[PDB]
Structure formats: C-alpha cells, structure tokens
Design an enzyme around this catalytic site. Structure first.
Site, PDB file in Angstrom:
ATOM      1  N   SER A   1     -99.039 -11.606  42.237  1.00 39.42           N
ATOM      2  CA  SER A   1     -99.939 -12.952  42.729  1.00 39.42           C
ATOM      3  C   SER A   1     -99.554 -14.280  41.924  1.00 39.42           C
ATOM      4  CB  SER A   1    -101.303 -12.754  43.031  1.00 39.42           C
ATOM      5  OG  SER A   1    -102.080 -14.133  43.020  1.00 39.42           O
TER       6      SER A   1
ATOM      7  N   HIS B   1    -101.543 -10.816  46.630  1.00 41.67           N
ATOM      8  CA  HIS B   1    -102.821 -10.281  46.165  1.00 41.67           C
ATOM      9  C   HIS B   1    -104.111 -11.321  46.226  1.00 41.67           C
ATOM     10  CE1 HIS B   1    -105.415  -7.738  44.083  1.00 41.67           C
ATOM     11  NE2 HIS B   1    -105.425  -8.433  43.019  1.00 41.67           N
TER      12      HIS B   1
END
Lengths: 233, 193, 101, 187, 165, 174, 172, 179, 133
Positions: E42, E67
C-alpha cells in the site's frame, strides 16, 4: 577514463579508508555475505547500477549465505530474491557475470547461483546447495485473507520453478518434486542437474574417499544369537 | 497446570495404594523420593509375603534421589515387582532392574534407555576434580549393579551405556533388563494364502 | 498558520489536526492539580493568539473552534477556514501533464 | 588493539597495518558475520600478490558452516599459506590449524591449548526432515575426519574413535601426532 | 539530465508514507520513472503510480497489492468516532488517486478496497496501475536509459579528476 | 463433573498429552480393570496432540486390560487421540458425524552431539515403523498407502473414515 | 456455582477451549442420565473461541432425547450464537437488551507452504459446515448466510426473531 | 458472612465488573425470585467500572425479577454502578450520604480491518444511544439534557442527585451530605 | 625499543593470561612491567612474565594469586576429560611462576589452593617483583 580513477581512489578514498567493502568494490568483486533482508537487497541493487556503467568488463559474484532466513529463526518474505535476480539477468548481454559458490547456499542463494552466465557458473569442492521450500509460516490472522494466501504460495512456487527451469533447462514438475523435502545437493552431481557449469578444483587434491572403509566382512553363522549392540564406528 | 485434576489424580493413586501399587512421579528428585520411600515402608502392614507392584515411568532426574529408592527395594521382606509402562530413563530403568529376579515384568511396547548419569561441576580448580570423581564413582556403581543384575561382563556395560542407548523389551529380555513380558494371547488372524 | 501570510504551502492530501494539549503523569495534591491547570490555561491562551493573528478571528472564537475537541481538517476546507493558502510551488498532476500532451 | 599504528607515513589501524604486511589476525569466535570478512580478505590479498599468508588464531569455538567457508578458500587460492598458533584454538578453530601449510608451516607457542572434537548441529521439526539433517550431520562428521587424517598422517579409524569424545592436546603431543610442524622458541 | 529514477521494493509500511512519496514525485518538473520489483504494498503502489505515465514498468516476479488503511485507535466514545471517520477519508483518498490515474470509475475500485487482494503483472496493465510489462527485452532499454543520464554527470566527474591530477 | 462419571468407567483424554497428563490416564486405567474385568470401559477423545512417548503410553495400557474397550472421539484428534481412536477392538469404534480426524506423523527432539542426533533419528525411525504396523492391523490396509498418508497433514471426515477402517460406526446415522 | 447443577443449569462462560469443552459435555452426560424428560437451560456468554471446541459441544446437544433451552446472557460473538441457533425451535430465548454477533471463526495456519494450503481447506470446509448448518436453523437462503458471515454483524434481539436466530424473548 | 446475607435476600456487587462476576449475580437473583416473588431484594453496588456488555445483563436481570428491588450505593459508582443505581424501583432507592456518583460513557478499544473499525464505531455509539434513552426514563429528564451531562467526566454529590431524578431517598435525613 | 605497559586488572579468565605471557617472551628486547592498584591472576602472569630486574611495583599495589576457575555441565564422560584440563592448567601456571621465584613447586600448589593476596613488602620476598617504585 575510469581506470585513472581506480588508481586515484585507492590512494585517497579507498586505501586509507580501512573498510574492506570499499576495496572489494573497486576490484569488480561483489560478495553477498549477509543474510538477505530489506537492507541487503537495496545495497545489492545500488552496486549493480554502478558496475554496469563504467566498463563492460566482467564482474565476479560470490555467494555465501543461508538465504533470507534460517529454519530456527524468524521468517520474512521471499520476493527480494527475484528482485536481485531480474536485475542481474539483463546484465548478461551487457556485461559478463562470473558466479562462484563459496561456503553454503541455502534456499534462494541457489537461485542466484543459476542466474550467472552459461559457461561461467562454478562451485567449490565442499559446497552445499539446498532446494528449500519458502516461506512465511505465520498465518494466524483473519481467515478471509488465507484464500488469497493460497494463491500467493501457489504462484510464487510457479514463478520460482519457471526461473529455475529457464537456467537448468529442466522440467518444471521436477522442481516441485525437490520442493517437498529439503534435499541437499552435492556439487559433483549438480553439473548433471544443471545448476552449475563446472567445479573448480584445487591445485593439490588431498580429499581421500571413504569407499575403502568397507573391508568386506563375512556373513555370520545362522546358529549364532547375535547381540543387540548399537552401530557405533 | 489445572488444579482440578490434582484431586482426581490423588484419588486414583490412593485406591491403587490399597492394592499395593506405587508410582514413580516424573523426574526423580528430593520431594518425591521421600514420598516414594514412605509408600514402600507402609505396604508391609497388610501382608509381607505377597509381591509389590511398582509402576515405573520416569523421563529423567537426579542421581542421589534414585539411589534412596534402590536400597529400600532390595532390603524389605516382600518382593518388589517393577512394571515399566511408557518410557524409562537411565534412573528409571535402574529402578526397573532393581526388582526381584524373575518378577520383573513389563509390556513389549515400552522404551528402555540406559546411560551414565547426567551431572555438572562448578567451583575452583580442585572443586572440579572432586565433583568429577563422585560422578565417576556414580558411573562405577550404576554400571556395577547393572552387571550383576543382567549377568554381563564389566566391559559390556561401560561400552553400551556410554551414550543414549534405547532398547525394546523384545531385545531387553536377551540382555537382562526385563525378565518377562505381559501380554494377552491374541486370536490367530486369517492371513492371505 | 504562524508563517508568512499568502505563502502557506501544503500537500493536497495531508491531514491537519488542532486539539488542546495534555499533560504527562503528575502525582500531586489538590494545589498541585491547580498549578497544572494554569499551565494548560496559558497553553490555550497562547495557541489562540497565534490563530487570531493568522485566521483573523477573535480570541474566544479560536478557543471554541479549534482548541475545544480533538478534530481534524482536510486540505480543501482549511483554505476556506484560513489555515493554508495555496499548494506547493511547481505542483502538477501526472494525468494533467498527459492531457497537455 | 584500539589505538592505531602507522604503515609508512600515515595513521592506519593495527589489524589493517598487518593486512598490508600480509599477516591475518583472528581473535574472536568464528561466526557467520566475521567469516564474511575473512574470506573476502583472502581473495583481496590473492589478487594483489602471490606470497605466503600468515594466520594467527585465537578461536575459542564456533559454528560448523562458516568454518568450512574459510577452509575452502585456503585451497582455492593460488598462493601459499601458513598457520601459526598463539593462545588457544578450541572446537572448529583447531581444525583450521591443519587447513594448510602441511610442508613445515604449522607453528605453535609452547603453552597453546589445543582441542579436537566432532562437530555438532541442531534442527528440529518434522520427523521426515530429521532423517535428512541427520544424513547431513553424518556426512559432515566423516568428511571432517578425512581431512584431519590426510593432514596429520593419522589413520582414519583412530580419528573416529578418539575425536568422538573429548580430546585435548599439549604442544608436546602435537608434534608426535602430526597436528603441528614446529614449536616456536623464545626468539 | 533531470530525470529521476526510483526503484520500488516494499512489502509493508504505513499507508500515509505512500501518499507522501506520491506527491513528492508529482511536483517535480521533469519526468520520473518507477520500476517495481518484488512486491508493491500500500505504501509502494502509490509510489509506483506517482511516476510519469508511460514510464511505469512492473516485472513478472513483482506482485502489486492494494491494502486498506491500517490504524491504531484508542480513546473515549467521543474520540472514537472522529478518527474512524478519518479512515473513511483515507479510503476516499486512495480510491481517488486510483481513479484519476488508472482510467477506472470510483465504484469498481471501492468494491475492491473492502477486502485485501494481491495482483499479478498481467492484472497491473489491465487495471491501469502501470503501462508496460518489464520483460527481459524492455529491461535492456532501462539499462541504456540510466547510462546516458549518469554519464552526463560522470562527464563532469571525468573532467574534475583530470584537473586534480 | 469428571468424578461423577468415573465410577462407570468414563475416561476423558482432555488437553495436551504431557508427562503428567497422560500418567493420570494410565493410573486410572489400571483401577478399572482391577475392580471388574468383564464389563466395558469407555474412553472419550478430545485432544489436539501431545508427546510421542507419553501418547504411546495410553495405547499399550488399554491393551493391558482383559475387558472390552469402547472409544469415542469428540471434536479434534491430532495424531495422538486419532491413533488412540482406532486402538480399540472392531465393532465398538464409534465417532461423531462432525468430529475432525487428523492424521500426522509424530515429532522428535535432540540437542547434543551429532552422534546424539542420529540416535534420536533412528529412535523416531523405529517409532514411525512401529505405529505403521499397528495402524495397518485394525484398518486392513497395506503398508504402501499407510506410509504416504502419514507424510502430509490430512483432516479426514468420518464419512470416508468408515471405509478407511479407522472407525466402525457413526452415532446418529448421518 | 454449585447450586445451578442441581437445578439443571450449566454455565457457558468465557472463551471456549479444550478443557472447558470437556467439562461442558461432562455436565451434559449427567443431566440427561438423571432425567430424560426435563429440559436443560444453558446461559451462554462467550466472546468467541476455537473452531473444534464449539463443534464438540454442538453435536452432543443433538443427542439429548429431550429438548434443551438456550438463553443469551449479555453477548455471543461468532461462537456462542451458533450454540443458540442449534437449540430447539420454540425454546430459543434471549434477553431484550442482549447482543448477537455472527462472524466466521478465528484460526491460524502455521507450517509449510504445502501445509498451510491443506489446512486452509479445512477452514474453508469449516465455513461450509458452519454456514451450511446455520442456514437450516434460520430458514433463510444459502446466499444471505454466506454474505454477512465474512464481516462482523451485530444483531439486536428484536430483529433476531424475524431473522431466525432466537424464537422469543423473556420480558415479564 | 456472605451466606448469612444470602438467606436474608441481600446480595453484594463489589469490585470490577467482569464476565465471570456478571453471571454470579444473575444466577442468585433468579433464585430469590423463584423462592419468594413478594419479598424485596436489597443490593449493594460498589464498582469502579466495568464492561458495557456484562453490565447490561445485570440490568436485564433486575427487570426480569418480578419482585421489587432495593439499591444501596456505598463506596464508588463509576460509569456502570450509577446506571444500575437508578434502574431500580422508584421510591426505594437509597444510598450513603457521602457516596460518589459518576455518570460517564463506557470506554472501548478498536483495531483491525477498515471495515472492522466502522462496525465497532457505530456499535459503541449504539451502546451510547441505548444507555442514554434507558437512563432517561426513570429520571424524568429530557433526552437533550441527559445526553450532554454524561459527556462531562465530573462526579456528582448525592445532594444534587435527588432533584436530578436519579435517586429518591438519602439515608441520614439529608443533613449529613457534605458539599 | 623497550616495551612499557601498565598492569591493572581485577578479574578475567586465566586462559587469557597465558596468551599475554608468551607474547612478552616473543619480544627480543627487554620488558618493563609496572603494576598499579590491583593485579589479578591474569595480570600476575604478565607481571611475572617480564624480564628479571625490571619488574616495578608501588607501595599500595596488591597481587591476587588463585587457582583457575571454570564452568562444567553436560554428559558424564567429558567432565572427567575437562577435570584433567583444569588440573594441568593449574600445574602449568605453577611452572610459570617457578621459573621466576626459584622456589620448589610443591609449596606453590599449597598457595594456589585458596585465594592468596600479597602486599608490597612480601611481593619482593616471593619473587613476583624486584623493587619498590
């Protein structure tokens, strides 16, 4: 030209600096001695960006590590071994890469062993090659993400066997057969497996075999109750 | 540990104490050895002619605690029939071998381990050689009594119990550890022809 | 907000938070909690004096808006409130550069 | 060894001054991190010139796998080697005394404590992989005994029986056992 | 020249650190090339999309991952509502950057942020996070691209070593 | 609780099989055969595993008694209670329709010298060959397929456990 | 807590593990043996627990030849609510201000990469077993049970009657 | 001891409220209602806090009791005991003349997935909304005034608790209450 | 030319004292050993290892003389092998002191039985030093 910089840096900025990693960097020798982590993989990539620039001269690559993590310690991720694999794979037509196995090679260290140029990969007499099954034993989190973790462990074993079959010129199903158990590999028979090209031998061979230990003991009589003493040589 | 299982464990060992059955509890140290010698010196009140059943299960322990159980088994008037179920250590198999000759029973699925006893040494320079001599004295006495129980030579015991030596009661009956095995006769199965 | 007015630079996806401050672990008597209350009394009076000079509000307005509760501020509505003025100099989106090409 | 010295005109550290004088010092135990600096130092002195390398050992013990990394670099290089003992070499450090310099180049102090024993390991888990690591520890045990039999001239059947237990040597018995070549005198 | 070459390798990290290195690559006047290796978490997928469109490459061994924002929350009942709404603002923030840069609507991306899911190299070009597949052939172009931009600074380095000697 | 049913020969193998936990099962097993050798003894199974030498101590002690043996499995039995589930006689090995049957090979342990590793290696090689002879007796299965089943971890439903020979009946019928 | 045993009341308190599940079915062996006609009332208060521990007490309640009664006390988080729905129809009671939470059960995967995929199939088999049995107890479709069990969903006792978790509430 | 007060139908709620301590009071409350549904039950509350999940079970147990209940507050009543103080029958609510009353919202921690945070964020808000509307019934107070007094983390003397509507009578003739 | 070092140690293993002992006789030139404060068993081996006639000591310095110490744990067999190790090390350091003090060896083992401390006066009489600085 950079060869005058090689004689000038060793006088001022590499010699009286007592660090051995700097003097090894100037001689085009890149040695992986530490276990691979987040600090090692970025250091190995940054040294590869410099070596491809100054000369097409051949570079020596020594591998001596237990891979990323030992079986008796905390485990991490296995994606950093591919990142240094694909970085050095495109160098082979630009610069020759010499790869020699010193010490041991556990797991992902054998993947960089076959990542060298054909005809230049080598190993020592008492090396050890391990085809370990990696990684990430920790799975104690939420069950909604384990189904995509089954996809991760299946496709990572697929691309690792694909990159190993591209160098060893073998079948991909034979790589998963060696991934079921941690099978060790003798470097004398690893030339037939396709991992290394040759085995460099010392100038004076003094490693006597142990096949003369079998003296040919005779078979005991059938009417003799043998003792249960344990086999201890 | 669960405190609920303690009173259930105390109940089943006391009901077997009326049937003259003792127990070797875990590793042999000082707290159980005074409790175990209190049990062998109490079963003679009912009768001193019938045998004494001894459940033997010990994964290890000290040296001097097991010697305090060894001398009282061969001194009391009734015979002590040892029974090894599970796993017997070097001190546990010595307790099993210290029973009455011909009354040492077991089952053929146990594991019998015999070796020189574990120990350590700490102190000055002359303290090391003093504490090493009593371990070798305990090496000679453990291997000396096993040569008399099994009937083997002196060199045979020191060369087999030098390291970890695991045996089965099918082969321990040939050496001299277990006198006989206890197993019910099974029905013959119709094998393939 | 205490910088030069007209040049408060900011990233377009940052987070801004103004909450009244707290004190560490102090173990004292009844008069020891009173002197610690005076330290936080001067904390809200000094922080609102900076926000009154920046945002152009009163002294009691910045205590009711900012220094009452633990709130957060985005980038877009802070320009209307008076915290920031513009973005960073030389900022340009990579998609807006593709639209020029 | 914390104050530095001089090479010819400038300040250089004491262990690096002997590196230019082709003398290698080993004072700590053989671990994975210090073995990476030793086998990188053997390849650096081999690339500069081809002369005899001197190794002074103070190893009180170590692991098996990084010790074999330093042993194989002694035979790979095209230069000569000479191991000299001062202090003590215990465990796998005593095996590196018999690494090279077999033709009269193994020196020792008259009060050096020598130690020879079989290597060890530890790896647990599944019962099926316990058979594989047992084959690795067996294949490492007899191979380490074959190198000590060829270097010292001892029979192979005596090294298995003696080095399986605890064995310690003084420099008076190290001459007749073929473990060292000469004993260092007062000068 | 003025080109910036960054390498992308991160298996974790906070979500807020990935947005900072995103806009740090946006306000650069010259172009930027991002090369993803190993994984893209992420914090790393936002650095991958922060480069110039047309120079983003993902290898076959690299795996992009999207994420949700992970955070630590502790406080009273009045304080637990204000910071949980910030998680809705961050989820609105990372879905906005994924929408403006990948030619995708905001509804289909927000149906992907409720559950963590890993992506391959083929799904990276299909969604729009990258532009080309970093195979062995186009990797040779990255080697020659970083050779001309480094020798432009090394030509000045070659003149300083000759002037000192 | 447990003492209210102990007089009717009810054995509960709860918790992890340890040196003290399995010894409480063995010491109460000799009490039930000494009081009455003609009626059956029921043994309940709910355990996630345990030791190799301690978990073997329940099997040979149940074979020491001359009476009948009933075994019931509750929940999960992981390589210690599952080996003890089929340890009873044929016809009285019942199981619940939702109980999980886990087949696994046991573990080992060694710390000392390298010659002490190979002693424990052949010690667990003897224990692996011992249980494969036992598990092939009450299941009527050959030794070729029963060695590979203990290689990998396999959670088995009681629908396929009836034809495998480990259990005999299913309580409830479905 | 011994006065509830004579009144045929067992207590399900805390997280369910192996020693609690062995004690809970031991009280169920005795209460049906003294009387096979009178019901057994259980007060369930659990925040979760193991996968096989909650399934070890589910099957033994179906073997009780009289019906049982389950009353929610406070909260049942993804393991106790399965014990509520497995009761007899018309005997599932709950407090008016209690809480019912339905979620997939917790569980880890430790071991080899070949091991963690063969043990996650059991967790996927446990998800089909839990949602397959819960759909028959509530009378709803198969899709709506697998749709809300992935994330945590709290249910009021007023809406638990129309969904099918409980049958009635004790207000008095 | 504690068994002498049990046969006289007087129970004690002491210490921190846990899940193991919750059902011990509920199990003995229904035993007194089955023995005598006419005789009152006197309780004593001394709690410095507790969980909002197990504390509501004590409130539902007193609502399940058919007989009348009497409450007594001694020591502390912090965020859980003050809710159980006013929850008894009106006119039979006594306490000590110097005991402290704390009306504050319960606490809670949140961690995990992004969808997991917003579930428990509105759950503790629904617990805050349900605890406000229940405590506003027996106090005869408006909802907007009782929802802001619970936000202030300040204790309450029993002198001003009487006209607030939380309590009815004070033991001691209402002259021993100190400010 | 002549090496000059300061001797100051209150602890440490005596095995390291044998390493610094043989290193001092490896020097061809003389050695000046000057002890200050505390001289432990590892420090007294370097004090006695110097050249005879150039071992100085102060008025307030002391010398600690004691037998070697070690930690032994494990199997029964290697304790007996290591018991001869600590015995012959104690016999080795007795022969190290005997080359300087010119005393019979059986009297030094009696002083090596327990801890033995010396002040500045009897250090000259026992031959560990030469004179008072």
């Amino acid at each position: 030209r950079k060869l005058s910089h090689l004689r000038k840096k060793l006088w001022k900025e590499a010699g009286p600096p007592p660090d051995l990693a700097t003097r090894l960097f100037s001689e085009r020798i890149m040695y992986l001695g530490m276990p691979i982590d987040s600090s090692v993989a970025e250091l190995l990539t940054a040294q590869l960006f410099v070596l491809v620039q100054e000369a097409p001269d051949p570079i020596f690559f020594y591998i001596n590590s237990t891979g990323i993590a030992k079986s008796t310690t905390k485990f991490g991720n296995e994606h950093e071994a591919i990142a240094v694999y694909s970085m050095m794979k495109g160098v082979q037509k630009y610069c020759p890469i010499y790869t020699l196995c010193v010490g041991n090679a556990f797991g992902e260290a054998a993947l960089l062993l076959s990542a060298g140029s054909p005809g230049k990969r080598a190993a020592l007499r008492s090396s050890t090659i391990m085809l370990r099954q990696p990684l990430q034993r920790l799975g104690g989190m939420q069950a909604s993400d384990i189904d995509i973790y089954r996809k991760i462990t299946r496709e990572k074993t697929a691309t690792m066997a694909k990159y190993l079959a591209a160098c060893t010129k073998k079948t991909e199903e034979q790589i998963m057969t060696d991934f079921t158990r941690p099978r060790y590999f003798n470097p004398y028979e690893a030339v037939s497996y396709g991992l290394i090209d040759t085995v460099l031998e010392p100038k004076e061979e003094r490693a006597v075999f142990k096949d003369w230990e079998k003296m040919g003991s005779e078979i005991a009589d059938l009417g003799l109750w043998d003792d249960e003493e344990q086999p201890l040589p | 540990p669960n405190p609920l299982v303690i009173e259930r464990f105390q109940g089943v060992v006391s009901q077997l104490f009326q049937q003259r059955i003792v127990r070797l509890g875990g590793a042999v140290d000082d707290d159980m050895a005074n409790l175990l010698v209190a049990q062998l010196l109490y079963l003679d009140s009912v009768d001193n002619k019938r045998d004494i059943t001894m459940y033997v299960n010990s994964p290890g322990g000290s040296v001097t605690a097991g010697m305090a159980v060894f001398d009282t088994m061969r001194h009391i008037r009734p015979d002590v029939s040892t029974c090894c179920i599970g796993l017997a250590a070097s001190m546990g198999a010595f307790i099993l071998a210290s029973g009455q000759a011909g009354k040492r029973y077991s089952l053929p699925n146990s594991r019998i381990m015999i070796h020189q006893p574990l120990g350590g040494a700490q102190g000055q320079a002359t303290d090391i050689e003093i504490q090493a001599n009593e371990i070798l004295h305990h090496k000679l006495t453990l291997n000396g009594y096993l040569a008399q129980f099994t009937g083997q030579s002196m060199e045979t015991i020191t060369k087999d119990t030098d390291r970890d030596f695991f045996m089965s009661p099918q082969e321990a009956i040939e050496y001299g550890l277990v006198d006989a095995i206890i197993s019910k006769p099974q029905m013959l199965q119709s094998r393939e022809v | 907000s205490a910088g030069q007015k007209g040049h408060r630079y900011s990233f377009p996806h940052a987070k801004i938070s103004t909450a009244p401050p707290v004190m560490n672990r102090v173990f004292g008597q009844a008069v020891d909690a009173q002197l610690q209350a005076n330290e936080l009394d001067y904390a809200t009076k000094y922080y609102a004096a900076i926000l009154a000079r920046s945002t152009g509000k009163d002294l009691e307005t910045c205590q009711k808006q900012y220094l009452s509760r633990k709130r957060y501020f985005s980038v877009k509505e802070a320009y209307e409130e008076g915290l920031v003025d513009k973005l960073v100099p030389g900022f340009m989106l990579n998609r807006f550069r593709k639209m020029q090409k | 060894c914390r104050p530095p010295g001089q090479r010819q005109s400038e300040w250089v550290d004491l262990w690096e001054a002997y590196t230019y004088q082709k003398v290698v010092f080993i004072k700590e135990a053989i671990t994975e991190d210090v073995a990476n600096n030793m086998i990188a130092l053997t390849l650096y002195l081999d690339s500069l010139d081809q002369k005899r390398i001197y190794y002074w050992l103070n190893v009180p013990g170590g692991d098996v796998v990084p010790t074999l990394a330093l042993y194989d670099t002694m035979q790979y290089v095209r230069s000569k080697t000479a191991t000299v003992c001062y202090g003590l070499c215990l465990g796998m450090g005593g095996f590196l005394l018999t690494a090279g310099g077999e033709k009269g180049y193994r020196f020792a102090m008259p009060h050096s404590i020598l130690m020879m024993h079989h290597p060890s390991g530890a790896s647990r888990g599944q019962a099926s992989e316990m058979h594989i690591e047992s084959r690795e520890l067996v294949r490492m045990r007899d191979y380490l005994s074959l190198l000590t039999s060829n270097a010292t001239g001892q029979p192979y059947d005596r090294v298995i029986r003696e080095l399986s237990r605890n064995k310690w040597m003084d420099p008076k018995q190290a001459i007749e056992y073929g473990m060292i070549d000469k004993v260092l005198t007062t000068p | 020249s003025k080109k910036v070459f960054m390498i992308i390798n991160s298996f974790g990290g906070s979500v807020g650190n990935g947005i900072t290195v995103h806009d740090a690559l946006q306000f650069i006047k010259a172009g930027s090339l991002t090369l993803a290796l190993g994984v893209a978490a992420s914090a790393a997928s936002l650095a991958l999309a922060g480069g110039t469109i047309g120079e983003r490459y993902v290898t076959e061994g690299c795996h992009t991952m999207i994420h949700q924002p992970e955070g630590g929350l502790n406080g009273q009942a009045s304080d637990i509502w204000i910071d949980s709404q910030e998680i809705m603002k961050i989820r609105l923030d990372v879905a906005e950057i994924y929408s403006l840069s990948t030619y995708r609507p905001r509804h289909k991306i927000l149906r992907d942020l409720d559950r963590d899911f890993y992506l391959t190299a083929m799904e990276t070009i299909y969604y729009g996070l990258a532009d080309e597949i970093a195979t062995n052939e186009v990797m040779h172009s990255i080697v020659e691209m970083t050779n001309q931009v480094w020798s432009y600074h090394d030509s000045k380095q070659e003149r300083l070593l000759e002037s000192r000697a | 609780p447990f003492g209210l049913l102990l007089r009717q020969r009810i054995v509960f193998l709860g918790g992890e099989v340890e040196d003290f936990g399995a010894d409480a099962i063995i010491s109460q097993l000799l009490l039930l055969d000494s009081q009455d050798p003609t009626k059956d003894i029921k043994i309940f199974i709910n355990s996630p595993g345990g030791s190799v030498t301690a978990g073997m101590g329940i099997y040979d002690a149940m074979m020491l008694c001359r009476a009948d043996v009933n075994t019931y499995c509750f929940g999960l039995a992981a390589s210690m209670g599952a080996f003890l589930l089929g340890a009873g006689k044929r016809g009285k090995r019942n199981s619940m329709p939702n109980s999980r049957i886990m087949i696994h090979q046991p573990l080992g342990g060694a710390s000392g010298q390298a010659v002490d590793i190979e002693i424990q290696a052949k010690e667990i090689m003897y224990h692996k060959a011992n249980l494969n002879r036992i598990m092939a007796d009450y299941c009527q299965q050959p030794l070729s397929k029963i060695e590979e089943d203990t290689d990998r971890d396999r959670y088995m439903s009681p629908l396929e456990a009836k034809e495998y020979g480990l259990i005999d009946h299913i309580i409830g019928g479905e």
